[PDB]
């Protein structure tokens with residue numbers, strides 16, 4: 344019984360449903376994998392260092408949550424897969440003593456979306472989530488607009504062909520995505536009257552927070568606009584992460600089955 348250590352770095356961190364669904368899968372596939380994984384939440388001080396901490400804890404793999412996803416992309420030894428276009432890393436694997444960075448948010452988000460027929464999207468936020476979601480939605484051929492408070496990640500989104508606005512675009516969007524940290528603060532990501540304008544005219548309000556009904560989602564619910572929280576995304580990207588942690592031994596669709604059940 345070789346033991347292998349995993350975790351999720353975040354700040355804040357201990358509401359994470361991730362250790363439960365990953366340890367479920369580490370328990371289930373012990374025999375295929377030929378080790379027992381264990382997965383813990385990890386409070387990472389803002390002023391620490393993801394790579395150094397990873398090496399010091401002896402981890403075989405990690406997930407990375409806000410606000411460290413852009414930092415993870417910068418400090419990895421090597422970036423593979425769609426991560427390269429996301430400028431954000433949410434999955435870390437030790438491969439050949441090199442810290443390798445993946446992004447499973449993009450495809451995780453893709454798989455959570457039950458409908459295809461959205462023309463355009465407004466993304467709120469500019470962290471690693473917004474970055475992966477913009478990259479995924481452009482890929483699908485939506486028009487993507489991005490609105491942050493201030494000047495953050497301008498160049499990244501510009502270079503994808505996103506329209507980066509200063510003020511709220513006066514325009515209808517099918518898909519309104521909250522990828523800010525606002526729900527965490529129990530806050531709306533935008534002035535309320537503005538958001539209501541988007542909601543009266545949009546097709547789906549989408550919040551990355553999972554579990555609790557956020558101010559953003561509850562206002563969409565109040566206006567009767569269809570809404571979706573981050574639960575389905577969370578299960579998909581975890582499954583996809585797990586496929587990485589398994590060094591491609593266990594395909595994400597098998598992980599997803601155990602994970603969705605347990606959740």
Ligand SMILES: O=C(O)C1=C[C@@H](O)[C@@H](O)[C@H](O)C1
Nearest residue numbers: 351359361406407408433448
């Ligand atoms: O709440 C969590 O544990 C996570 C949320 C997302 O940011 C994911 O990208 C991350 O892998 C895990």
